[PDB]
Amino acid sequence: DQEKGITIDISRKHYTVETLKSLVDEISYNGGNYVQLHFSDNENYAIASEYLGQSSENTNNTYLTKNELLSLIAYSNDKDILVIPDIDLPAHSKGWLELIKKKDVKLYNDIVTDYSEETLDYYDNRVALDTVNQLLDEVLDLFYQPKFEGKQRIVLGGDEVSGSEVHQLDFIDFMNQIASTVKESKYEPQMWNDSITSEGIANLDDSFSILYWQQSTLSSGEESLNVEDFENWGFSVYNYNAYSLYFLPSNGFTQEDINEQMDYMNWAYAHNKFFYISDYYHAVETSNVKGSSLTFWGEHATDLSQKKLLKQELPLIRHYLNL
């Protein structure tokens, strides 16, 4: 059994709870297993947080209200859909850091890297970890789903982490700490593949499953880890193929563009065809593949209405889930 999931960037692009409910409808209709809610990135933190000071119980253009989010999860669970929270650490973090800035400038200066406003100081900084751990406790609580007790998961990010190649062991140790927090609440931790190196893989908690989206190149020009490599060190992977399984909804796109996307997916997509440097659709023969996901990234969706978002996403969801 392979899982199939949809991942929705609700950070770079605002989504009503109704749009998300209709998306989950389509996921359930076609026998999908999960939806991944990428709600924290540089542009915005798009759910409600006591801890960060997003409390309004009223609908708004910034974040899902607590009850909105909780309604969405209850809805998804009723359709046998697991909701997987996705909070991006330690980079892609400007959104909630700006919230910490406004809440407590002193704490902000104690946890932000000296060089990036998007990156939390993962370089062995205790107060950075403590802040994150509190934010994670709130998030683990919000996404509690008793129907999926003992199968819940959370994406902790780990993608595009500046400094992580050179300072690999600090990256890994940080990822292990936040892994530890979430295992405390019985979730399985997950992260993107891209910032983990040969140096780091031996120290990484193998409780992590990996979201394999694109094989990285080291600064030497050498090839970074592939799925076999991850298999060799005990890591399960999921195919998030950056070509076949990524799509950026855009105002410019018509019906014919969506038709072309579906014709492309017909040949480009398979459950086990990952994006390797050499072959963008590389068939892999390992035993560590657990599923796949189509992902809607939000950063081209600037001028899309809720309706036009549905019009683009709904058919791609259906096509992917039936391939």
Ligand X SMILES: CC1=N[C@@H]2[C@@H](O)[C@H](O)[C@@H](CO)O[C@@H]2S1
Residues 88-147 within binding reach of ligand X (CB under 6 A): 92
Choice between 125 and 291, CB closer to ligand X: 291
Q: Which two tokens stand for residue 174?
A: 């940080």
Please choose, from the candidates 159, 179, 322, 312, the residue with its C-alpha nearest in 3D space to the C-alpha of residue 247.
Answer: 312
Dihedral over alpha carbons 297, 299, 305, 311 (to 10 degrees): -30
Q: Which of 3, 160, 165, 205 binds ligand X (CB under 6 A)?
A: 160
CB nearer ligand X, residue 159 or residue 170: 159
Task: Report, in Å, the least distance between residue 88 CB and ligand X.
Answer: 8
Q: Which residues between 245 and 304 bind ligand X (CB under 6 A)?
A: 297, 299
Size of the site for ligand X (CB under 6 A): 7
The least CB distance from residue 309 to ligand X, in Å, is 16
Between CA 31 and CA 264 the distance in angstroms is 22
213 binds ligand X (CB under 6 A): yes
Whether 132 and 158 have beta carbons less than 8 Å apart is answered as: no
Instruction: Figure out which of the listed residues 34, 96, 171, 192 binds ligand X, where binding follows CB under 6 A.
Output: 192
Q: Which is nearer to ligand X, 160 or 223 (CB)?
A: 160
77 vs 69: CA distance, rounded Å: 12
CA distances from 294 to 24, 243, 266 (A): 13, 10, 13
Q: Which residue carries 């068939």 as its tokens?
A: 283
Smallest Cα–Cα separation from 147: which of 55, 225, 80? 80
- Of 148 and 238, which has the nearer Cβ to ligand X? 238
Of 25 and 160, the one with the shorter C-beta distance to ligand X is 160
Site for ligand X in 38-97 (CB under 6 A): 92
Tell me how far apart the terminal alpha carbons of the chain are, to the nearest angstrom: 15
Residue nearest to ligand X (CB): 159
Residues in contact with ligand X by CB under 6 A are: 92, 159-160, 192, 213, 297, 299
